[PDB]
Structure formats: structure tokens, C-alpha cells
Amino acid sequence: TAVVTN
Amino acid sequence: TAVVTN
Amino acid sequence: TAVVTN
Amino acid sequence: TAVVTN
């Protein structure tokens, strides 16, 4: 699980 | 699972 | 599962 | 499953 906000 | 906001 | 907003 | 908004 990878969750990114950029 | 990969979840990205950019 | 890949979910992307760009 | 791939879901993309661009």
C-alpha cells in the first residue's frame, strides 16, 4: 500500500 | 494498492 | 489497484 | 484495476 499526496 | 494525488 | 489524480 | 483522472 502506497498513498501519496504531492 | 497505489493511490496518488499530484 | 492503482488510483491517480493529476 | 487502474483509475486515472488527469
Residue numbers in the entry:
A (entry chain A), B (entry chain A), C (entry chain A), D (entry chain A): 1 to 6
Extract from the study:
Here we identify two segments of TTR that drive protein aggregation by self-association and formation of steric zipper spines of amyloid fibrils.
We found that 119TAVVTN124 forms a Class-2 steric zipper (Ref. 25 and Fig. 3D) in which the β-strands stack into parallel β-sheets with one sheet face packing against another sheet back. The side chain organization explains why the residue replacements E92P and V94P hinder TTR aggregation because the proline substitution would decrease the shape complementarity between sheets in the steric zipper structure. 25 and Fig. 3D). The side chain organization in this peptide also explains why the residue replacements T119W, T119Y, V121W, and V121Y impede TTR aggregation. Taken together, these experiments suggest that the 119TAVVTN124 segment is important for fibril formation.
